[PDB]
Amino acid sequence: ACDYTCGSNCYSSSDVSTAQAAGYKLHEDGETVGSNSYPHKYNNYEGFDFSVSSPYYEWPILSSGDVYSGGSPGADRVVFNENNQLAGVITHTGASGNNFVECT
Numbered sequence: 001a002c003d004y005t006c007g008s009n010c011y012s013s014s015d016v017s018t019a020q021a022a023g024y025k026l027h028e029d030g031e032t033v034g035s036n037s038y039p040h041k042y043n044n045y046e047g048f049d050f051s052v053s054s055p056y057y058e059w060p061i062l063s064s065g066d067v068y069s070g071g072s073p074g075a076d077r078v079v080f081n082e083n084n085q086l087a088g089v090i091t092h093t094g095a096s097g098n099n100f101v102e103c104t
């Protein structure tokens with residue numbers, strides 16, 4: 001079963017813990033990867049009910065299970081805060097433009 005489903009991509013809690021660790025280490029190093037420079041700040045204008053406080057940062061989670069290292073980021077993201085707490089799993093799949101919906 002999937003712990004998180006984004007569109008038709010299925011992720012387990014191991015997949016999310018692995019992506020968050022990689023994204024949080026780049027935040028501590030003051031580094032980014034990719035043409036769109038991830039991780040970067042996430043603004044919660046859609047109002048998802050996250051139970052952890054901001055600031056928030058978005059980082060890609062790949063359907064393949066690999067950690068993101070550049071190239072296409074796909075449409076799914078883990079959002080974590082400044083204290084390395086997971087806020088949620090969201091995706092651009094099924095939302096217009098740069099908006100997001102939550103994975104279920």
Ligand SMILES: [Ca+2]
Pocket residue numbers: 010011012015064065
């Ligand atoms: Ca997986």
